[PDB]
Design an enzyme around this catalytic site. Structure first.
Site, mmCIF file in Angstrom:
data_model
loop_
_atom_site.group_PDB
_atom_site.id
_atom_site.type_symbol
_atom_site.label_atom_id
_atom_site.label_comp_id
_atom_site.label_asym_id
_atom_site.label_seq_id
_atom_site.Cartn_x
_atom_site.Cartn_y
_atom_site.Cartn_z
ATOM 1 N N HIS A 1 72.922 20.680 52.647
ATOM 2 C CA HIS A 1 71.900 20.213 51.724
ATOM 3 C C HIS A 1 72.181 20.823 50.346
ATOM 4 C CE1 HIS A 1 70.094 20.085 55.768
ATOM 5 N NE2 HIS A 1 69.206 19.232 55.290
ATOM 6 N N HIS B 1 69.445 15.323 48.653
ATOM 7 C CA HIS B 1 68.627 16.299 49.407
ATOM 8 C C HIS B 1 69.416 16.883 50.586
ATOM 9 C CE1 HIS B 1 65.654 17.670 52.403
ATOM 10 N NE2 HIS B 1 64.824 17.886 51.394
ATOM 11 N N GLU C 1 45.551 28.771 64.827
ATOM 12 C CA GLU C 1 46.487 29.338 65.805
ATOM 13 C C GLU C 1 47.934 29.335 65.318
ATOM 14 O OE1 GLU C 1 44.375 26.855 66.555
ATOM 15 O OE2 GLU C 1 43.141 27.484 68.219
ATOM 16 N N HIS D 1 40.864 22.126 78.125
ATOM 17 C CA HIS D 1 41.014 23.551 77.872
ATOM 18 C C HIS D 1 41.853 24.264 78.936
ATOM 19 C CE1 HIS D 1 38.026 22.693 74.893
ATOM 20 N NE2 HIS D 1 37.921 23.957 74.531
#
Ligand SMILES: [Ca+2]
Ligand SMILES: [Ca+2]
Lengths: 675, 675
Positions: A25, A259, A413, A476
């Site tokens: 890149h 890029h 999280e 859950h």
């Protein structure tokens, strides 16, 4: 000027590295070379001591641009050479396609997966603030370093960076200075196609300070001034908007094509010509650039030398804090710290392993100052700070102090996972942890995998591990989660059955230097087992109940060990003699000697695994597997166990079937293989 | 008023449900009852036809508040009763602790895991805009429905919601109206501890419209007016800030304690007394509330009746579009659509499976109008729109139109996953897909798991599946990823070896009605196999090379099938006869008859698996496993394969060792088990 020559040198090293690999890149390295030059000139670092604890840290979050990082490291005389650059992206080289902290001198973290590095920067800055608050004294600025992060548009789209940026603004992390490569190009093309938000307005909304540099292709004076401005704002992280041209100088500058693919050879020739380099030469390093960079290294080395003397004077004035700091910089825990670990007997009451974990933390946090941690998406009733501590908050809020030990991550999280990696990356023996429900550790899989690849000793305190959580139901209740992480290289996944096993899990987690830990803990109460100990559980797997004439061995983890012991009693009534093996961590067990492992899982006896989760992986240790390979249910936990036949009678039935299935067959250990 | 009585009824049903379970979350239901009442009064829906395609959709993203959703559904006469409410959170009930679209009439999606529902709402709104652009004509507003979403503070902290909100603002989704429960409380306590950002300023930065309702505890007139205002803003999604008191009315209102635990019995008594209810009575439904709600249902049913007549008139004026729409509402694909799938022979050239996938999409998109999809964190060179289509964008941008078929998700994998779930949830037979690298499907694990639980036929186009990607290195190379998703219930994980297998994978993905698909595709070229076909690959696993006197069978997937075929030739030279099995999808294979499966993996012959990824799961199908259980490397792909001995000679060596290991042993199929 030498500064202009340096910038051209950086640009051309990066371009030449990509050309040699025919991969990588070149666009962002071309666009960010002026900023990289300006930032490294402001940074304090020693290429000959990459672990100096008061160094400024640099993180390249747009990790695909790493030809840029390698070029800086080479130019500054880190343990990386032009010969290594020539081997960019080549098997076994010191210059992999994305930077790896284990492999690359001066790579603080492993970046590449988008969004991660900025979060890692937040963690490095969080750790620096906690460390400085712990050790600094009047006339003793032991820690006063900055955290510099480069990031791109892709990083700003990833949700993890939003999470970490919101939290960093809340935490008033004034030593964090991030630079956005505002080049209007992502992989798909223009940012106009999918990314039209007002980034600056969003960062203001998080409480960041902003500096805008309108011509970051050339204006290194303004980039340096932006750093100086950021350093004056001590109560806000700063975002510096660098308006750049992707691929600056290339015939294809300002396009998506630069890029992520090598430049054309004729393009590289005209680059060299327009910047005063020889178009027939590759990997040129003008001696004047080396000299200029060496001057800055010499100055930084004198700063480190003065810091060493400051540290010696600190140890004279503050002997106990000095010794503590020395121990941590040596990578050593306090002597006999593990004597604080709680020990249980079978006469003690049943306790949930989440509660046993709380108790361990309560005992070890006061004894081991390098433990800090927190929780995300979790009630304070399920995990909170150790008694005698305070939350990590800026004092200005009145809610804590930077000397605090407990981090309120919020419902974040993934960022918690990546911030933990940054805290570990800071060094100074930090042993840091993050609490959530086991099922939502999966939200942070991107970061967890990087903990493993990066060899960081982070710890997930992952409660509510199974259908044992009951009423919250299948949204859950983990099924696949342990299999996922056990299948990932270099993750210890502890699922302790009782008090002694929980203490062993923490002994492993805190002693770790290269392996992340996940501790899978229960909502529901479990008995203290006959035969458990910290010593035996420290081996990862051990014989809990030895039976010399065993018809079968039951291997189990966590809540299912007690179930196996109850099943043994049912089996005795059916004339079947069983042994029980507890396997609290498969990775730790796998690392034991072959003879130890065979003593636990011998030849000549069928072996049944029991764990109320996916059966994936379990054939490493068993002939037959009793698990749960469907989603759970919403109800009282004991009723769910009964529904799925995870009962003493259900285990016994399957054990009896296993014995019958192997009658007249020769059985060897599941540990045996053909190759 | 009856409106006030209705709000009290909702509140008390929710409280009573939580009380009966002694589990669940009463605070948000108490705070949001006025808003729920006001929104449902504005919504068009038929409790007796939950699938009416022009219904307004409601999504409760703060899914822990589901006592609230169930109370609304009961009051409006969905197929859910007060008796079901009494069984809230009880094993086997219709009222699980978090709402499940498979189980609960009127639950559009499965929420609970935070952040997901708002993203699902974005997808429902995206689908509605695409659907309306496809079918609406002058005087024929076939689709003109709204998407209403409730969300909480936790949802606003999760990065996935930032991703989706940024994208929704970009997409100018004016039929999306979201309501933030601004109650200043999360699980850990006050939002002051971790969530101090200016949420409204952030949402403005994304291009959302804002309405603020300062007293949402009582001011239902203002909530209704906010909806009317939002409907006038046709080019921006709207966020309505509802300033509420968590647990409104409770003695413990405004505290974290009411967020997630049942109220005290005396608290419930005073609630009932202050609102004119009998404190000795539970689950009260005043007949005046029922009547009021039934009036709104009757009005909505007349609207649906008029829509049915509009649809009949549409079919008369636009016969072909009408028939297409009818077919889609019947859940049927076009007749013989699969004749468009490409078919290959062993005479055709080697092609990467990513390219084969592009070709399939190019052929099927023009034939199957209900296919839409996009990509996130992926070059346009790796996936772009089908020729003859345009991107899904608001026409105002000049970059696409809402009739477009290709979604530019940006670098937003997790939100792409959750938005795909919302597009599927819209209905009308949408078969939608999302492209990224396989390794970063893991960023979206939260949503992927919900695709499986929700039974949504979404498709991940997951390229760069292994070390075969080469130079990007171990940060990008999957190891654990297939094991993770294969271990999750109800995920088809296709890893096609060649052109015919890639067509079978798409046939499965597009025909799916209840099972999400992940297609693991290669960067590198693979040969067309002798013995492959769409028919055989449709069985999930099949005998590619039959060998009646086999010494061993090699089972493989993807890029390793060709490797196995080359190894067979090496083995022939060593006097060993091998068969080859190709296992492009383990789930589809598992669903075949026991006799079919045994014809593929018979008794009496050792079986070796080969796949350049984790060996977890593979013991279901093999005796010995050759896999990769360590992280990868940065280099040219063929060199990495050679390093890890994934070569014809390396496979042959392990096959020969396997034959030797089983000499003199009785071998039964890995498909056999004891129970
Ligand atoms: Ca960019
Ligand atoms: Ca809240």
């Amino acid at each position: 000027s030498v500064d202009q020559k340096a910038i051209s040198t950086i640009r051309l090293l990066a371009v030449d590295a990509v050309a040699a690999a025919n991969s990588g890149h070149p666009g962002a390295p071309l666009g960010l070379a002026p900023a990289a030059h300006a930032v490294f000139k402001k940074m304090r670092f020693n290429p000959k001591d990459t672990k100096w604890i008061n160094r400024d840290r640099f993180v390249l979050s747009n990790g695909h641009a790493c030809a840029l990082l390698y070029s800086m490291l080479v130019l500054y005389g880190y343990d990386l050479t032009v010969e290594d650059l020539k081997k960019f992206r080549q098997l076994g080289s010191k210059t992999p396609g994305h930077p790896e902290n284990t492999d690359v001198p001066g790579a603080e973290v492993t970046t590449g997966p988008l969004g991660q590095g900025i979060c890692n920067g937040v963690g490095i800055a969080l750790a620096q603030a906690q460390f400085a608050a712990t050790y600094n004294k009047p006339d003793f600025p032991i820690s006063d370093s900055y955290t510099y992060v480069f990031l791109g548009d892709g990083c700003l789209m990833e949700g993890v960076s939003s999470e970490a940026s919101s939290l960093a603004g809340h935490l008033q992390l004034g030593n964090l200075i991030a630079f956005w490569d505002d080049n209007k190009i992502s992989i798909d093309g223009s940012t106009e196609v999918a990314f039209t938000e007002d980034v600056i307005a969003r960062y203001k909304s998080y409480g960041w300070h902003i500096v805008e540099v309108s011509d970051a292709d050339t204006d290194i004076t303004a980039i340096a001034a932006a750093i100086d401005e950021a350093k004056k704002v001590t109560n806000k992280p700063t975002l510096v908007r660098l308006t750049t041209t992707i691929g600056f100088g290339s015939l294809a500058q300002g396009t998506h094509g630069v890029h992520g693919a090598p430049l054309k050879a004729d393009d590289i020739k005209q680059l060299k010509t327009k910047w005063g380099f020889n178009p027939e030469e590759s990997f040129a390093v003008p001696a004047e650039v080396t000299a200029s960079y060496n001057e800055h290294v010499a100055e930084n080395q004198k700063i480190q030398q003065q810091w060493n003397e400051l540290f010696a004077a600190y140890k004279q004035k503050y002997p106990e804090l000095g010794a503590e700091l020395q121990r941590r910089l040596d990578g050593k825990l306090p002597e006999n710290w593990d004597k604080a670990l709680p020990v249980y007997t079978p006469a003690d009451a049943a306790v949930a392993t989440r509660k046993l974990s709380e108790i361990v933390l309560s005992k070890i946090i006061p004894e081991v100052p390098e433990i800090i941690g927190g929780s995300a998406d979790l009630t304070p009733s399920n995990l909170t700070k150790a008694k005698g501590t305070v939350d990590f908050q800026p004092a200005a809020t009145g809610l804590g102090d930077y000397s605090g030990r407990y981090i309120r991550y919020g419902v974040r999280e993934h960022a918690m996972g990546a911030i933990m990696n940054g805290i570990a990356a800071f060094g100074a023996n930090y042993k840091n942890y993050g609490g959530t429900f086991l099922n939502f550790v999966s939200y942070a899989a991107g970061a967890v995998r990087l903990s493993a690849l990066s060899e960081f000793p982070i710890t997930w305190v992952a409660t509510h591990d199974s259908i044992g959580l009951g009423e919250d139901g299948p949204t859950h209740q983990p099924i696949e989660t342990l299999a996922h992480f056990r299948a990932t290289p270099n993750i210890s996944v502890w699922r302790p059955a009782d008090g002694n096993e929980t203490s062993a899990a923490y002994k492993s987690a805190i002693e770790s230097t290269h392996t992340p830990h996940i501790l899978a803990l229960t909502r529901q109460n479990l008995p203290q087992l006959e035969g458990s100990s910290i010593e035996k559980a420290s081996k990862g797997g051990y014989t809990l109940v030895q039976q010399d004439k065993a018809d079968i061995i039951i291997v189990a983890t966590g809540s299912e060990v007690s179930l196996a012991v109850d099943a043994l009693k049912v089996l005795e009534g059916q004339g079947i003699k069983a042994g029980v093996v507890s396997l609290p961590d498969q990775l730790t067990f796998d690392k034991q000697s072959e003879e130890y492992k065979l003593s636990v899982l011998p030849d000549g006896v069928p072996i049944l695994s029991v764990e109320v989760m996916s059966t994936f992986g379990w054939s490493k240790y068993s002939h037959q597997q009793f698990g749960l390979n469907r989603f759970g249910a919403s109800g009282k936990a004991p009723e769910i166990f009964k529904l799925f036949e995870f009962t003493p009678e259900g285990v016994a039935e399957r054990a009896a079937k296993t014995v019958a299935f192997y009658k007249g067959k020769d059985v060897v250990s599941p540990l045996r293989s053909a190759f």
